[PDB]
């Protein structure tokens, strides 16, 4: 996250990380046993970590839970990133407390201008490599679809939107994919891609969770 | 010899996935994923190769 801040305590209890011997993506706890992330985060083995803030120094409330089932969206497109969404079934159920809890799915598609909180342990530098210990947070509003599609001509499908600032300087970055875009208590977006990070006229593009609400419950139900 | 693989891109678009899946350049620099590396080779007109997967 570029241009963000240290998340206050227990400010994002739904945040999780996906791990393959290093921290490589974020995700969101949406059910006692399920995390949602991006399709490009797929790996054949994944360990989920919940309740972190400092990713290098244990604070004591961390839970380490390997993925039992890992389900990339069946129409995931590696070349265009359309349907860049993924479900993960935890092999045991998370213990719910003040630092680990679920977040609701959205009851309506993103609304232009709503303020959202985006979070993750991705890059904090727009040039180079500066990856933080402390979990990062960014308030940034949803941008209009006029603005979004002008920013990425021909490449924004109906399963995508833009969050941030056209003037640049504040964005999600590498290592943040899969992480949450939460607006008024609903998971509206998943960190997916962009042209670099925090550049002029290149805001982050995020998967619109509302379009998969039905698939998520159905796919979860079949594997419960 | 013992050379490096040319980096390549799949995203026929204007941007890159935001995974962290670093790769080690022949310049000694770790790039967070292969896509970001091909963009730098386009942008700065360079030709860094992939020495090996993972960080440098």
Numbering used by the authors:
A (entry chain A): 24 to 247
B (entry chain D): 24 to 79
Text of the article:
(1) The serine protease inhibitor Kazal type 1 (SPINK1) inhibits trypsin activity in zymogen granules of pancreatic acinar cells. TRY1 adopts the typical serine protease fold containing two β-barrels sandwiching the active site cleft of the protease. The inhibitor assumes a typical Kazal domain structure with a reactive loop surrounding a central α-helix. SPINK1 binds on top of the TRY1 p.S200A active site in a substrate-like manner, creating an interface of almost 1000 Å2.
We solved the crystal structures of TRY1 p.S200A bound to SPINK1 WT and p.N34S at 2.9 and 2.1 Å resolution, respectively. Similar to other known Laskowski-inhibitors, both SPINK1 variants bind to TRY1 p.S200A in a substrate-like manner. The specificity determining P1 residue Lys41 is oriented in a way that interacts with Asp194 in TRY1. Instead, it points toward the sulfate ion bound within the SPINK1 loop. With this uncommon histidine conformation, TRY1 would not be able to catalyze the cleavage of the P1-P1′ scissile bond, as His63 could not function as a proton acceptor for Ser200, thereby not creating the strongly nucleophilic alkoxide ion. To analyze the impact of SPINK1 binding on the catalytic triad, we employed molecular dynamics simulations by using TRY1 WT and SPINK1 WT complexes, with His63 starting in either gauche+ or trans (Chi1 = 60° or 180°) conformation. SPINK1 binding sterically blocks the His63 rotamer conformation to flip from one state to the other most of the time.
